[PDB]
UniProtKB/Swiss-Prot annotation:
The chain holds residues 271 to 421 of 421 of the full protein. GO terms for cellular component: axon; chromaffin granule membrane; cytoplasm; dense core granule; excitatory synapse; glutamatergic synapse; Golgi apparatus; hippocampal mossy fiber to CA3 synapse. It is found in: Cytoplasmic vesicle, Secretory vesicle membrane; Cytoplasmic vesicle, Secretory vesicle, Synaptic vesicle membrane; Cytoplasmic vesicle, Secretory vesicle, Chromaffin granule membrane; Cytoplasm. Homotetramer. Heterodimer; heterodimerizes with SYT2 in presence of calcium. Interacts with SCAMP5. Interacts with STON2. Forms a complex with SV2B, syntaxin 1 and SNAP25. Interacts with SV2A, SV2B and SV2C. Interacts with RIMS1. Interacts with PRRT2. Interacts with DNAJC5 in a phosphorylation-dependent manner. Interacts (via N-terminus) with RAB3A. Interacts with SYT12. Interacts with calmodulin. Interacts with DNM1 (via C-terminal proline-rich domain (PRD)); this interaction facilitates vesicle fission during clathrin-mediated endocytosis (CME). This is Synaptotagmin-1. Ca(2+) 4 binds at D33, D39, D93, D95. The lineage of its organism: Eukaryota, Metazoa, Chordata, Craniata, Vertebrata.
Length: 151
């Protein structure tokens, strides 16, 4: 079962230790509501060794599997710590009643792999420039597992 794909940009300013993630849009998201579609919003957690340093979240787009956001978020990450953090991006379904269930999840950062690592590395090699990339969303539990694997 495909969960969907998320587009975001990454920008790192080395002198200011400023990390900017713009949630651009998502597409082909999993349908999460019986009798409807999904009500997606996107969480961003800045992590460091299990602990969460800071959280952000988009607005909610109701009744769509293909939401457009273009919402920007900045994080203070000093130069010396930028290869020690994880930027965890989660698409969830909003429900007025009950816990919001995650659709899928991905993380970028040094410990990441494949296209996630490539996005992260292209950001670091191209300072002050926003790099946009698509990511396939994965099962929350699998991502949570890999976040424990240090390089
Ligand atoms: Pb819902």
């Amino acid at each position: 079962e495909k969960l969907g794909d998320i587009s975001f940009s990454l920008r790192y300013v080395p002198t200011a230790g400023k990390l900017t993630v713009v949630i651009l849009e998502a597409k082909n998201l999993k349908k999460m509501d019986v009798g409807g579609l999904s009500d997606p919003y996107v969480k961003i957690h800045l992590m460091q060794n299990g602990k969460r340093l800071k959280k952000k979240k988009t607005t909610i787009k109701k009744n769509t599997l293909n939401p457009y956001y273009n919402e920007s978020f900045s994080f203070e990450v000093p130069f010396e710590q930028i290869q020690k953090v994880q930027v965890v991006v989660t698409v969830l379904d909003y429900d007025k009643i009950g816990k919001n269930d995650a659709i899928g999840k991905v993380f970028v950062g040094y410990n990441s792999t494949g296209a996630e690592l490539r996005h992260w590395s292209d950001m670091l090699a191209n300072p002050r420039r926003p790099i946009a990339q698509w990511h396939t969303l994965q099962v929350e539990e699998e991502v949570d597992a890999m976040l424990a694997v240090k390089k």
